[PDB]
Structures are given as structure tokens and as C-alpha cells.
Amino acid sequence: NLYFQGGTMYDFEYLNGLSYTELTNLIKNIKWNQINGLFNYSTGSQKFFGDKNRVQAIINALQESGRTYTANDMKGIETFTEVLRAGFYLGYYNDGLSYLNDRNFQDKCIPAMIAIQKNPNFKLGTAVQDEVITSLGKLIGNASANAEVVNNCVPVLKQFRENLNQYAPDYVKGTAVNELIKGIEFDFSGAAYEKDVKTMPWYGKIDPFINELKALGLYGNITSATEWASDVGIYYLSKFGLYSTNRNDIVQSLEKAVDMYKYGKIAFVAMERITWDYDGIGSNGKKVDHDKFLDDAEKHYLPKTYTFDNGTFIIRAGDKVSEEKIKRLYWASREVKSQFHRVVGNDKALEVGNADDVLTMKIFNSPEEYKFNTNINGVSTDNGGLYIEPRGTFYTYERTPQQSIFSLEELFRHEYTHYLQARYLVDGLWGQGPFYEKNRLTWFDEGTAEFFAGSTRTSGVLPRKLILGYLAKDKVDHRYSLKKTLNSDDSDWMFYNYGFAVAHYLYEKDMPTFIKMNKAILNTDVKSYDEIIKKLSDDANKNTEYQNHIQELVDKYQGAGIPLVSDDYLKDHGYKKASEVYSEISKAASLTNTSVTAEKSQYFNTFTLRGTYTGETSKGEFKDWDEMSKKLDGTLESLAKNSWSGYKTLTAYFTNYRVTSDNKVQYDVVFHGVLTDNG
């Protein structure tokens, strides 16, 4: 025990020495944080809260300041309450203060609570009055409540309701009511943990309170600013509704919430409350179909369906997403796909009968509307969009330039690449096999995505201006070495931008290593991949190359752009007899043993042409790849010189590089374009 302070910071050793009179008066005019280690379990605090007479003194003093507080003076009610909250907290966690855990002791706070409630100043209004309510709600949270106490909250709820449009948007006002409700609910739920809810002092005695929550929940005229309040109303209507004699009446109000706000946030909550709090049984006594409700909700937000490639590529979209966009996205998928197969060298899906056999894209009208996707489909919506491979489904939304740096096409070009990685490159589950036991592909998965997003029809892969722009930052470190980028647990957001630079670097400056790397992933050769990463990491030379290549990108930024699909794709091409197109493409590409498939879409038809290409004597694999790129891009360009508009829709790739017994270069070649001949 001590009998001196120093510095307006107070120790328990010192507080323990004071008479109760002196103590309670001190607490009235100090902030709670001024008490040192207040929430800490000490011999000091043990001694302080261990005295049943002292805490009772603290309770009595709070009861007195509850009787006397005014709009201008709070009479330390905040401090009194924080001190008590500390009592109960330590009593919960530490034996020796366990008498503080007993609900029977906690009830000793009720007379103080009532005192606060009977004060004519127990109303929302000024900062003091509001803080008093906030403090009360938190104390109930740690202590106890009566049916009597709860019902005294009724005027405050009415006052809030009657002033919803002013009060709910106010942080302090809104926090007060929320703290009060949440506080009471926490105490009540705690007391009934595994006990029969029917045997509670307050059960059936809180009808006025419940009725006050119905009114909030079923307010109707919500805005963005006031929605949370009615949300609280519904959520806590369900919670307190448990202490009503009429179950079916409570569920009726919840079902009304669903009808009143539909496919908005509060209907989802109300619906959750029925299944979780009320056994998913309605007011009529029959099982509410939660699954149908979610299906109804998805149909409301995603009413439009667009089908491509014989139903293997489906877009479900909001009513406001442009049809032009839909088409552009399809053609964008085609551009990225052709570049991807070129580099990777495989177009045959790795597994049979996976969900990605059909690609599905769900595009909400807006970021606002997008949020209900987590509700509807159980996925995070804290993103610009998301590909879920086990579902073969991409979720995103249409967006304005102000809403996102990325347009919808760009984001799709990026995410689409993950669909390609998972289907055609990485065997088994994406993110969950041998290649993921160690953290080997983080740079690669994200880097190749940014990279392939820049695919074009006839120019290969180009850097996107936006990523080039990012690279324009601090040269002096901050810039990653080759070794750092390849070997990421946290890193700053720039990590992905350097991953891109590596991918681009390898593509432009070192195709041989790019191909070797992809073949390793493709063949599931974890050892070859690790060896390649090792050589690159250990070789200071490749790093210097990479460092200057970063500079080269930074320089290219001035005149760069975003590779996006051409308006040419949307043009009315008109008729062209199918057989002429095939012959024309076969001659110009020198294809052999060709075959074709025609596919039906929502707005057009398409064909896929497959042929063998065999050229002259091989100049090595990587030189072969380079020339094949140039020879093929050249064919696509010259074909566009023809009068038929449809050649401008063509995309092409090659796969399965090999050499003949006579060292002649040999590839599988694929062309894709619009088809305008029915027969």
C-alpha cells in the first residue's frame, strides 16, 4: 500500500490505501486510462477487486451519479463503469476473483442501472447523454440485466426510431443505441447458453422491447445512411424474439422483412435469422426453402443469359451490362487463349470431365450489386473479381472508370488466364498439388496473368500501359532483384508488378528459359523447375539483364497502351461460303490433314480449323518457335488484306512442337474465327 501519487498517473497500490469515500470521489474525476494496469491481473488489482466492500462502494457511487447526472456533467459515470467492467473481466479470467463471475453478484449493478434509467436525462441528445447510454450498454454486456432494465430502454429506441434519418447516420448517436442492444443481447444469450430459454426471469416479459425492435426492423423507408439500423432491428428481433410466447408472430415479422426489402441486405439477414434462429420453419409451420430464395435472388441480379461455343462458355449478367461488352469479352477470351497455347504448347485439357469443361461468368451490374454474391454464392467479394476453378466460374461486375482502374475486359483478360493455367497447364487442383507444397509459383501465377492479359490478335503479347506505369517508381532498391522476385511471407504490392517484369523479361529476352519452365510445370517436374529458378537466382548475369529490362519497360511507358479487342469483331461481316474460308486459310498457312468444327453462339457462329504444319529444316526449338510466331502472325495479317471482313476475327496458335525423322519443323496449328455460312 502507498499514500502518494506523482504525475496524474495512479497505481493500484495507492488506490488500495485510500478510504472508500476518497476513492470513489477520485474515480469521479479521472479518466479510466489514468489507472495503471487497470485491466492487468496484479497482486495490486487482485487486492483491489478482491475487496467485496470496495467494489460495492464503487457500485453505490455509480448509483449516486446515475441519480444526479446532467446534460453538461456526466459525474464520472464513464469511469465508474470502466472500473466495474475491469472487475468482471478479471473475475472471468482469474480464479480468486471468481465471485465476480457469479451472476448473483453481477445483479448488484442493477440498482445503479435503474438509477441511470430513471434520470430525466436518460435520453439521446448531447455528448454526455449519449456517452452515458454507450457506457450503460457496455456494462450490461459484462454484468447483468433485468426484464425491468431492458424495457426501460424502450423510450430510447422510440426516440431513435422517430429520428432515424438524423440519428442513424450520426456515429455517436448510432453507436449508443447499437452498444445498448448488443450489450443486453450478450448478457441474455450468455445466461441461457445451454439452459432452457423458457426458464428465464425475463422470458415473455420483454414484449415492449421486442415490439420496439419490430418497428425498427420493419421501418421500410431505408436509405444507404439508415439501413444499418433496420438491419440491427431485424437481427436483434430474431435474438430477443426467443423470449416471446408467440414464436409464429416473431417469424411473421421476419418474413415481412424479406418481402419488404427483397434481394437487399436486410432480406438476406432476415432469411438467415429464420433458418438459424428459428429452425428454418415459417409462420405456417413448413420448412422455408432457403435454397430457392438464393436462386430467386441470383435471377433478380443476373437475369440475362448469353451462350457461346455450344454452351461451353456462358455469361449470366445483370440487365444493365452492355451486349457489346458481352461480345467483346468473348473475343478477348479468344485472343488470350491463342497467345497462351503458343507459349505453353498444349491445348488438350489435362483432366477429363472437370467443371471448367463449361466456363461460366456471372457479371453483376455494379460493385454495389456485386456484394450479394457472397450471400448468394458463398464467395468473397472483397475483390474486383474471382475465378473459382472447382466451379469453372468467374464472378465479377460491370464497373465505371471511377469505380476501378481496370475496365471489365482487362480484369477478365487477367482472370481468364487463371482459367487457362488451371485447365491446360497445372495438373490436378489449382493451388493444391506438388507444385504448391513449397511456394514456387506465386510470382509466376500472378506474373503470367498480368502478362497474358496483354495478348493481341496479330502482335503476340504486349505490355499493358498501367503496369508499365507502376514500374515508374523508386529505382534505388524498392526495385526487386531477379532472386528476390523468384523467391517470395509478406511482400509489398509491387511484388506482382515485378513478377510480371520477370515473365515479360523471359518472353522477350530469354524464350528458351520460358519454354523450359512451362514444360516443367506442364510435365509436373518440380525438380526441373526448381533447378531453373536456382540458375536464374544464382546467376548475377541474368539479374543485370533483368535490371536493364525493367528500365526498358519503364521507357516503353510513354507510348504504350492497353491491348483491347478491336471494333472489327463487332462488324457485320456478311456471308462467305464456309469451304472457301477453309481452303483460303489452309493454303495461306500451308496446313495439312486439316479438319474443322463449327460452333453455335448467341450472336454468331464460329469455326475451329485444325491442321498439321511441317516446314523446312529445324533451326533449333527456340528459333523455330520465334519464326513460327512470325510466319503465323504474318498469315493472319495477310488474310485480313482480303475483302471479307470476317478474317479480322481470326486467331491462331500452334502446339506440340516436334521435329521429323528428317529434322523438318512440325507443329499442330489452330485457327478460330466467325462463321457466316449456315449449311
XYZ file of C-alpha atoms in Angstrom:
679
model
C 0.000 0.000 0.000
C 1.080 3.534 -0.940
C -0.013 7.011 0.212
C 1.428 9.262 -2.526
C 0.930 9.581 -6.302
C 3.189 11.655 -8.603
C 2.344 12.695 -12.251
C -1.513 12.338 -12.542
C -0.894 8.634 -13.264
C -2.336 6.439 -10.473
C -1.207 2.991 -9.211
C -3.444 0.308 -7.587
C -1.041 0.088 -4.674
C -2.015 3.708 -3.997
C -5.743 3.349 -4.659
C -5.841 0.433 -2.201
C -4.709 2.774 0.588
C -7.498 5.286 0.136
C -10.717 5.221 2.128
C -13.769 4.313 0.036
C -15.015 7.896 0.236
C -11.712 9.265 -1.035
C -11.521 6.539 -3.690
C -14.964 6.890 -5.213
C -14.557 10.636 -5.359
C -11.218 10.283 -7.172
C -12.757 7.960 -9.782
C -15.478 10.582 -10.390
C -12.843 12.886 -11.787
C -10.203 10.869 -13.568
C -10.195 9.171 -16.960
C -10.176 5.376 -16.804
C -6.864 5.121 -18.663
C -5.158 7.074 -15.827
C -5.414 3.950 -13.619
C -2.222 1.958 -14.324
C -2.603 -1.659 -15.444
C -6.347 -1.412 -14.784
C -7.124 -4.476 -16.885
C -3.912 -6.285 -15.826
C -4.046 -9.096 -13.295
C -1.746 -7.991 -10.484
C -1.308 -8.653 -6.801
C -2.409 -4.983 -6.742
C -5.575 -5.392 -8.799
C -6.227 -8.728 -7.074
C -6.197 -6.847 -3.755
C -8.353 -4.032 -5.202
C -11.170 -6.059 -6.718
C -10.779 -8.798 -4.089
C -12.440 -6.498 -1.560
C -16.230 -7.101 -1.873
C -16.860 -3.987 0.234
C -14.766 -1.802 -2.086
C -16.484 -2.902 -5.310
C -19.847 -2.407 -3.595
C -18.665 1.092 -2.747
C -17.883 1.583 -6.423
C -21.342 0.292 -7.385
C -23.023 2.652 -4.851
C -21.094 5.642 -6.127
C -22.211 4.818 -9.709
C -25.793 4.511 -8.432
C -25.454 8.005 -6.955
C -24.001 9.632 -10.057
C -26.753 7.917 -12.058
C -29.291 9.742 -9.914
C -27.574 13.127 -10.387
C -26.000 13.351 -13.870
C -26.959 16.275 -16.064
C -26.655 17.160 -19.776
C -23.398 19.060 -19.139
C -21.832 16.896 -16.391
C -21.527 13.117 -16.532
C -20.456 12.708 -12.868
C -17.806 10.143 -13.834
C -20.341 7.525 -14.959
C -17.923 6.507 -17.711
C -15.064 5.963 -15.301
C -17.257 4.181 -12.735
C -18.435 1.808 -15.479
C -14.977 1.115 -16.917
C -13.636 0.285 -13.450
C -16.516 -2.143 -12.923
C -16.041 -3.665 -16.386
C -12.430 -4.286 -15.342
C -13.651 -6.052 -12.214
C -15.863 -8.501 -14.102
C -13.260 -9.026 -16.845
C -10.501 -10.108 -14.436
C -13.104 -12.093 -12.460
C -13.965 -14.068 -15.592
C -10.312 -14.954 -16.368
C -8.648 -15.297 -12.934
C -9.510 -17.614 -10.047
C -9.556 -15.762 -6.718
C -11.801 -13.117 -8.245
C -14.298 -15.850 -9.296
C -17.020 -14.404 -7.017
C -17.122 -11.573 -9.592
C -18.146 -14.111 -12.249
C -21.288 -15.129 -10.335
C -24.433 -13.648 -11.902
C -25.818 -13.281 -8.353
C -23.097 -10.707 -7.603
C -23.452 -9.035 -11.004
C -27.107 -8.232 -10.219
C -25.777 -5.767 -7.632
C -25.239 -3.347 -10.549
C -28.957 -3.301 -11.451
C -29.959 -0.655 -8.859
C -27.299 1.636 -10.366
C -28.536 0.849 -13.858
C -32.123 1.666 -12.888
C -30.885 4.907 -11.305
C -29.366 5.905 -14.653
C -32.570 4.948 -16.469
C -34.870 6.873 -14.105
C -32.761 10.045 -14.589
C -34.740 12.567 -16.706
C -31.519 12.959 -18.729
C -31.635 9.301 -19.821
C -32.216 10.174 -23.465
C -30.251 10.589 -26.662
C -29.191 14.220 -27.138
C -25.888 15.788 -26.093
C -22.485 14.056 -25.982
C -22.779 13.344 -22.233
C -26.284 11.833 -22.529
C -25.126 9.727 -25.498
C -21.889 8.580 -23.761
C -23.986 7.584 -20.696
C -26.107 5.263 -22.869
C -22.973 3.869 -24.559
C -21.400 3.207 -21.145
C -24.560 1.557 -19.838
C -24.783 -0.852 -22.800
C -21.190 -1.976 -22.272
C -21.725 -2.521 -18.549
C -24.780 -4.684 -19.143
C -22.514 -6.562 -21.555
C -20.165 -7.546 -18.700
C -22.660 -7.540 -15.816
C -26.422 -8.226 -15.710
C -29.818 -7.065 -16.907
C -33.465 -7.271 -15.854
C -36.622 -7.575 -17.842
C -37.133 -4.319 -15.910
C -33.884 -2.754 -17.214
C -34.401 -3.863 -20.824
C -37.895 -2.386 -21.044
C -36.519 0.941 -19.756
C -34.516 1.089 -22.987
C -37.836 1.334 -24.851
C -38.099 5.178 -24.855
C -34.543 5.427 -26.236
C -35.400 3.047 -29.065
C -38.562 5.035 -29.858
C -36.602 8.282 -29.736
C -34.117 6.808 -32.187
C -36.851 5.428 -34.439
C -38.697 8.766 -34.530
C -35.450 10.493 -35.505
C -33.963 7.782 -37.730
C -32.839 9.908 -40.678
C -30.945 12.319 -38.415
C -29.658 9.836 -35.785
C -28.693 6.598 -37.625
C -26.155 8.467 -39.838
C -24.552 10.016 -36.688
C -21.695 7.858 -35.476
C -22.029 8.729 -31.781
C -25.817 8.516 -31.676
C -25.818 5.272 -33.672
C -23.035 3.694 -31.675
C -25.001 4.378 -28.483
C -28.156 2.507 -29.493
C -26.101 -0.332 -31.022
C -23.916 -0.679 -27.921
C -27.051 -0.793 -25.762
C -28.809 -3.507 -27.789
C -25.685 -5.586 -28.374
C -24.861 -5.286 -24.669
C -28.243 -6.558 -23.462
C -28.236 -9.351 -26.003
C -24.751 -10.500 -24.953
C -25.820 -10.769 -21.290
C -29.054 -12.544 -22.165
C -27.581 -15.062 -24.593
C -24.799 -15.798 -22.059
C -27.277 -16.581 -19.268
C -29.253 -19.017 -21.453
C -26.224 -20.802 -23.006
C -27.437 -24.400 -22.688
C -30.323 -23.807 -20.312
C -33.975 -23.971 -21.405
C -34.885 -20.451 -22.589
C -38.393 -20.840 -21.074
C -36.868 -20.760 -17.563
C -35.650 -17.141 -17.599
C -36.836 -14.254 -15.348
C -37.372 -12.032 -18.409
C -38.935 -14.583 -20.773
C -42.256 -13.250 -22.033
C -41.649 -10.089 -20.027
C -39.932 -8.113 -22.834
C -42.813 -7.682 -25.310
C -42.495 -3.839 -25.330
C -38.781 -4.189 -26.167
C -39.372 -6.792 -28.863
C -42.167 -4.634 -30.287
C -39.764 -1.723 -30.360
C -37.323 -3.828 -32.432
C -40.030 -4.880 -34.910
C -40.686 -1.220 -35.563
C -37.015 -0.591 -36.320
C -36.628 -3.701 -38.429
C -39.775 -3.075 -40.439
C -39.134 0.665 -40.911
C -39.477 0.471 -44.680
C -38.021 3.832 -45.710
C -34.375 2.954 -45.573
C -31.523 4.747 -47.307
C -27.805 3.970 -47.561
C -27.235 6.025 -44.402
C -30.027 4.451 -42.291
C -30.004 0.818 -43.485
C -27.767 -0.487 -40.696
C -30.372 0.483 -38.058
C -33.142 -1.640 -39.571
C -30.553 -4.379 -40.101
C -29.862 -4.297 -36.339
C -33.628 -4.284 -35.721
C -34.182 -7.468 -37.707
C -31.116 -9.265 -36.371
C -31.956 -8.474 -32.766
C -35.678 -9.050 -33.351
C -34.749 -12.629 -34.036
C -32.442 -12.711 -30.985
C -34.869 -11.273 -28.440
C -37.815 -12.977 -30.181
C -36.661 -16.110 -28.397
C -38.136 -14.610 -25.188
C -41.591 -14.211 -26.723
C -44.515 -16.505 -26.002
C -45.534 -16.288 -29.677
C -42.892 -17.847 -31.922
C -45.007 -17.656 -35.122
C -45.613 -13.912 -34.610
C -41.882 -13.200 -34.480
C -41.257 -15.296 -37.586
C -44.111 -13.382 -39.280
C -42.253 -10.108 -38.799
C -39.055 -11.707 -40.149
C -40.912 -12.967 -43.225
C -42.315 -9.481 -43.692
C -38.731 -8.098 -43.715
C -37.932 -10.475 -46.569
C -40.929 -9.238 -48.583
C -40.384 -5.557 -47.743
C -36.704 -5.485 -48.715
C -36.063 -8.067 -51.348
C -32.722 -9.101 -52.609
C -31.373 -6.257 -50.458
C -29.135 -6.827 -47.389
C -31.913 -6.949 -44.751
C -33.857 -9.692 -46.557
C -30.701 -11.858 -46.513
C -30.267 -11.223 -42.778
C -33.967 -11.857 -42.064
C -33.697 -15.081 -44.044
C -30.554 -16.120 -42.133
C -32.372 -15.390 -38.869
C -35.238 -17.722 -39.810
C -33.018 -20.683 -40.697
C -30.507 -20.232 -37.870
C -32.618 -18.816 -35.016
C -35.956 -20.459 -35.917
C -35.100 -23.861 -37.386
C -35.929 -22.679 -40.919
C -39.616 -23.140 -40.156
C -42.051 -20.416 -41.250
C -45.069 -18.847 -39.556
C -47.207 -21.562 -41.182
C -45.058 -24.399 -39.789
C -43.484 -25.593 -43.042
C -39.781 -25.521 -43.972
C -38.804 -22.287 -45.737
C -36.779 -23.029 -48.878
C -33.587 -21.021 -48.312
C -32.023 -22.525 -51.467
C -34.866 -21.287 -53.675
C -34.623 -17.790 -52.142
C -30.941 -17.590 -53.104
C -31.807 -18.867 -56.593
C -34.523 -16.190 -56.828
C -32.015 -13.553 -55.726
C -29.427 -14.604 -58.319
C -32.110 -14.474 -61.038
C -33.004 -10.937 -59.953
C -29.426 -9.689 -60.118
C -28.366 -11.887 -63.059
C -31.491 -12.116 -65.238
C -29.766 -12.153 -68.657
C -28.065 -15.256 -70.128
C -25.661 -15.322 -73.085
C -24.365 -18.570 -74.560
C -21.280 -19.239 -76.682
C -19.419 -22.190 -78.228
C -22.238 -24.724 -78.000
C -22.881 -23.824 -74.351
C -19.290 -24.260 -73.169
C -18.946 -20.526 -72.473
C -21.895 -18.954 -70.593
C -22.366 -15.435 -69.286
C -25.078 -14.649 -66.756
C -25.372 -10.908 -66.414
C -27.311 -8.006 -64.944
C -29.880 -6.253 -67.130
C -27.640 -3.163 -67.448
C -24.471 -4.785 -68.787
C -23.990 -3.916 -72.471
C -24.380 -6.599 -75.160
C -21.377 -5.156 -76.998
C -19.316 -5.872 -73.853
C -20.512 -9.466 -73.783
C -19.249 -9.986 -77.340
C -16.006 -8.123 -76.709
C -15.330 -10.376 -73.687
C -15.852 -13.494 -75.771
C -13.385 -12.303 -78.413
C -10.989 -11.166 -75.716
C -11.032 -14.730 -74.330
C -10.006 -15.928 -77.802
C -7.024 -13.612 -78.043
C -5.648 -14.567 -74.646
C -6.214 -18.246 -75.337
C -4.224 -18.137 -78.616
C -1.177 -16.483 -77.020
C -1.344 -18.872 -74.033
C -1.336 -22.041 -76.154
C 1.534 -20.685 -78.275
C 3.791 -20.254 -75.243
C 2.663 -23.305 -73.289
C 2.455 -25.602 -76.317
C -0.579 -27.617 -75.165
C -4.295 -27.184 -75.966
C -5.554 -30.511 -74.637
C -7.187 -30.207 -71.189
C -5.256 -32.135 -68.514
C -8.172 -33.742 -66.705
C -11.412 -35.238 -68.064
C -14.859 -34.011 -67.007
C -13.817 -31.182 -64.729
C -16.242 -28.324 -64.170
C -14.193 -25.986 -66.484
C -15.492 -28.001 -69.444
C -18.118 -25.249 -69.228
C -16.846 -21.783 -68.367
C -19.353 -19.608 -66.553
C -19.133 -15.938 -65.917
C -21.502 -14.093 -63.655
C -21.377 -10.327 -64.099
C -23.290 -8.155 -61.647
C -24.483 -4.661 -62.697
C -22.287 -2.829 -60.229
C -19.907 -3.048 -57.270
C -22.917 -2.301 -55.056
C -24.876 -5.217 -56.510
C -21.754 -7.398 -56.579
C -21.732 -7.730 -52.767
C -24.791 -10.003 -52.680
C -22.649 -12.587 -54.469
C -21.053 -13.595 -51.208
C -24.584 -14.025 -49.857
C -25.772 -15.899 -52.935
C -22.721 -17.962 -53.855
C -20.665 -18.042 -50.680
C -17.570 -16.342 -52.105
C -15.541 -13.313 -51.127
C -16.480 -10.127 -52.891
C -13.558 -8.098 -51.499
C -12.047 -8.129 -54.946
C -12.506 -6.843 -58.479
C -13.499 -10.398 -59.417
C -12.746 -14.027 -58.723
C -12.249 -17.309 -60.550
C -13.280 -20.448 -58.662
C -11.761 -23.378 -60.512
C -13.714 -26.245 -58.933
C -16.795 -24.484 -60.311
C -15.252 -23.273 -63.570
C -16.891 -19.994 -62.604
C -15.786 -16.410 -62.750
C -17.614 -13.783 -60.647
C -17.222 -10.086 -61.356
C -19.283 -6.973 -62.058
C -19.540 -4.155 -64.585
C -17.776 -1.010 -63.337
C -17.120 2.616 -64.208
C -13.643 4.160 -64.668
C -14.158 5.979 -61.336
C -15.001 2.674 -59.630
C -11.925 0.749 -60.792
C -8.670 1.339 -62.585
C -9.305 -1.869 -64.531
C -12.184 -1.975 -67.033
C -14.213 -5.180 -67.189
C -12.407 -6.521 -70.256
C -8.934 -6.049 -68.683
C -9.880 -7.768 -65.461
C -11.334 -10.641 -67.483
C -8.215 -10.914 -69.641
C -6.227 -11.255 -66.397
C -8.536 -13.701 -64.570
C -9.224 -15.714 -67.700
C -5.545 -16.592 -67.620
C -6.074 -18.415 -64.302
C -8.780 -20.447 -66.011
C -6.168 -21.347 -68.671
C -3.438 -22.153 -66.129
C -5.791 -24.480 -64.252
C -7.286 -26.274 -67.252
C -4.277 -26.607 -69.541
C -1.084 -26.149 -67.542
C -1.200 -27.341 -63.937
C -2.299 -30.931 -63.378
C -4.823 -31.575 -60.599
C -6.305 -28.870 -58.383
C -5.051 -25.335 -58.932
C -3.063 -24.191 -55.871
C -3.161 -27.636 -54.284
C -0.669 -30.158 -55.622
C 3.063 -30.997 -55.765
C 3.869 -27.549 -57.166
C 2.313 -25.896 -54.107
C 3.955 -27.892 -51.291
C 6.563 -25.128 -51.380
C 5.876 -21.563 -52.552
C 7.187 -21.906 -56.129
C 4.626 -20.291 -58.441
C 3.358 -17.209 -56.565
C 5.381 -14.840 -58.766
C 4.547 -16.992 -61.801
C 0.766 -17.394 -61.390
C 0.261 -13.715 -60.775
C 3.008 -12.551 -63.176
C 1.863 -14.657 -66.135
C -1.703 -13.417 -65.548
C -0.740 -9.725 -65.838
C 1.317 -10.742 -68.806
C -1.201 -12.744 -70.869
C -3.781 -10.001 -70.209
C -1.805 -8.097 -72.856
C -2.443 -10.613 -75.640
C -3.300 -9.184 -79.090
C -4.585 -10.727 -82.296
C -1.501 -10.426 -84.572
C 1.273 -8.854 -82.457
C 1.785 -11.509 -79.761
C 1.838 -10.290 -76.150
C 2.364 -6.585 -75.408
C 2.953 -4.834 -72.069
C -0.052 -3.034 -70.608
C 0.402 0.699 -70.027
C -0.942 0.564 -66.459
C 1.595 -1.978 -65.252
C 4.325 -0.100 -67.101
C 3.176 2.979 -65.151
C 3.536 1.201 -61.804
C 7.095 0.244 -62.635
C 7.700 4.036 -62.756
C 8.693 4.328 -59.057
C 11.907 4.355 -56.883
C 14.897 2.899 -58.793
C 17.144 2.678 -55.691
C 16.070 -0.676 -54.233
C 12.316 -0.946 -53.880
C 13.123 -2.434 -57.315
C 13.359 -6.171 -56.898
C 16.325 -8.254 -57.886
C 15.672 -11.338 -60.030
C 16.423 -13.502 -56.974
C 14.003 -11.654 -54.707
C 11.108 -11.821 -57.146
C 11.561 -15.526 -57.726
C 11.779 -16.257 -54.000
C 8.872 -14.684 -52.037
C 5.928 -14.404 -46.287
C 4.645 -10.872 -46.934
C 5.769 -8.528 -49.710
C 4.523 -5.079 -50.763
C 2.013 -4.701 -53.633
C 4.890 -4.153 -56.072
C 5.713 -7.870 -55.891
C 3.202 -8.734 -58.633
C 4.441 -5.915 -60.893
C 7.961 -7.346 -60.726
C 6.604 -10.865 -61.280
C 5.142 -9.501 -64.483
C 8.518 -7.977 -65.394
C 10.209 -11.352 -64.948
C 7.616 -13.043 -67.174
C 7.979 -10.296 -69.752
C 11.760 -10.403 -69.489
C 11.809 -14.160 -70.112
C 9.366 -13.830 -73.001
C 11.279 -11.107 -74.845
C 14.905 -11.721 -73.776
C 15.072 -15.452 -72.919
C 12.367 -17.523 -74.659
C 14.394 -20.726 -74.159
C 14.063 -20.452 -70.385
C 10.380 -19.503 -70.569
C 9.621 -22.639 -72.615
C 11.749 -24.898 -70.392
C 9.908 -23.520 -67.328
C 6.452 -24.099 -68.805
C 7.401 -27.632 -69.898
C 8.439 -28.397 -66.321
C 5.109 -27.212 -64.841
C 3.286 -28.981 -67.649
C 5.104 -32.250 -67.026
C 4.801 -31.857 -63.229
C 8.618 -31.871 -62.973
C 9.092 -29.969 -59.698
C 12.850 -30.715 -59.829
C 13.439 -29.167 -63.289
C 11.504 -26.049 -62.293
C 13.479 -25.618 -59.069
C 16.739 -26.073 -60.960
C 15.782 -23.362 -63.450
C 14.788 -20.934 -60.677
C 18.094 -21.780 -58.973
C 20.251 -20.999 -62.039
C 18.431 -17.711 -62.551
C 18.673 -16.783 -58.843
C 22.371 -17.719 -58.553
C 23.472 -16.103 -61.832
C 24.313 -12.420 -61.253
C 24.376 -12.020 -65.050
C 20.706 -12.827 -65.634
C 19.947 -10.311 -62.882
C 21.792 -7.496 -64.653
C 19.870 -8.365 -67.806
C 16.623 -8.227 -65.822
C 17.539 -4.923 -64.162
C 18.028 -3.198 -67.515
C 14.947 -4.906 -68.960
C 12.947 -3.290 -66.141
C 14.365 0.042 -67.347
C 13.384 -0.843 -70.923
C 9.784 -1.392 -69.803
C 9.818 1.873 -67.841
C 10.973 3.600 -71.010
C 8.229 1.959 -73.128
C 5.593 3.505 -70.849
C 5.315 6.812 -72.762
C 3.945 5.211 -75.950
C 2.321 2.075 -74.508
C -1.391 1.191 -74.468
C -3.915 -1.350 -73.212
C -4.380 -4.273 -75.575
C -8.162 -4.438 -76.026
C -10.328 -6.187 -78.606
C -10.923 -4.403 -81.937
C -14.233 -2.885 -83.058
C -13.673 -5.058 -86.141
C -15.008 -8.052 -84.225
C -18.430 -6.394 -83.868
C -18.850 -5.601 -87.562
C -21.485 -7.196 -89.822
C -19.193 -9.376 -91.887
C -21.851 -10.831 -94.161
C -21.867 -14.143 -95.971
C -18.832 -16.068 -97.042
C -19.095 -19.688 -98.114
C -17.504 -21.837 -95.439
C -15.422 -24.034 -97.775
C -13.642 -21.010 -99.291
C -12.567 -19.808 -95.855
C -11.117 -23.210 -95.020
C -9.301 -23.508 -98.323
C -8.120 -19.918 -98.055
C -6.738 -20.484 -94.561
C -5.205 -23.862 -95.498
C -3.268 -22.522 -98.497
C -2.020 -19.428 -96.715
C -0.816 -21.392 -93.703
C 0.315 -24.498 -95.683
C -1.790 -26.736 -93.465
C -2.108 -30.463 -93.999
C -4.568 -33.127 -92.896
C -6.984 -30.345 -91.790
C -10.357 -30.732 -90.051
C -12.958 -28.222 -88.879
C -15.741 -27.783 -86.330
C -18.483 -25.189 -86.412
C -19.956 -23.881 -83.199
C -23.166 -22.015 -82.425
C -23.315 -18.858 -80.327
C -25.860 -16.282 -79.174
C -24.973 -13.686 -81.843
C -22.839 -15.533 -84.377
C -21.259 -18.804 -85.344
C -17.592 -19.740 -85.263
C -15.354 -22.439 -86.661
C -12.183 -24.025 -85.393
C -9.732 -25.213 -88.036
C -7.026 -27.809 -87.132
C -4.118 -28.723 -89.402
C -0.609 -30.108 -89.316
C 2.180 -27.766 -90.311
C 5.538 -29.123 -91.456
C 8.220 -26.663 -92.530
C 11.852 -26.691 -93.566
C 14.888 -27.937 -91.618
C 14.823 -27.127 -87.907
C 16.934 -24.208 -86.644
C 16.606 -25.294 -83.007
C 13.466 -25.306 -80.866
C 13.534 -21.747 -79.684
C 14.452 -20.260 -83.049
C 11.688 -22.463 -84.517
C 9.177 -21.045 -82.059
C 10.218 -17.497 -82.960
C 9.891 -17.947 -86.707
C 6.635 -19.894 -86.343
C 5.266 -16.916 -84.415
C 6.341 -14.555 -87.175
C 5.197 -16.801 -90.015
C 1.771 -17.312 -88.368
C 1.204 -13.695 -87.364
C 2.120 -12.853 -90.966
C -0.558 -15.193 -92.309
C -3.218 -13.646 -90.016
C -2.201 -10.200 -91.265
C -2.250 -11.020 -94.970
C -5.610 -12.768 -94.610
C -7.004 -9.505 -93.224
C -5.985 -7.887 -96.517
C -8.835 -9.784 -98.219
C -12.213 -8.074 -98.821
C -14.118 -10.370 -96.418
C -14.465 -8.596 -93.087
C -14.530 -11.915 -91.160
C -10.794 -12.578 -91.470
C -10.256 -9.805 -88.962
C -11.897 -12.103 -86.396
C -9.232 -14.779 -86.856
C -6.994 -16.024 -84.055
C -4.356 -18.732 -84.344
C -1.902 -20.746 -82.318
C 0.399 -23.743 -82.630
C 1.162 -26.588 -80.245
C 3.054 -29.876 -79.896
C 6.308 -28.715 -81.421
C 8.374 -31.567 -82.742
C 10.846 -32.415 -85.461
C 10.536 -35.100 -88.153
C 12.910 -38.046 -88.726
C 14.429 -35.712 -91.343
C 14.723 -32.762 -88.921
C 11.830 -30.857 -90.514
C 9.996 -28.477 -88.152
C 6.472 -29.734 -87.364
C 3.537 -28.154 -85.478
C -0.196 -28.539 -84.806
C -1.924 -25.321 -85.922
C -5.317 -23.944 -84.916
C -7.360 -21.101 -86.448
C -10.534 -19.660 -84.952
C -12.967 -17.146 -86.450
C -16.536 -16.034 -87.145
C -18.576 -18.229 -89.482
C -21.370 -16.836 -91.660
C -22.326 -19.919 -93.678
C -25.258 -21.981 -92.329
C -25.325 -25.240 -94.423
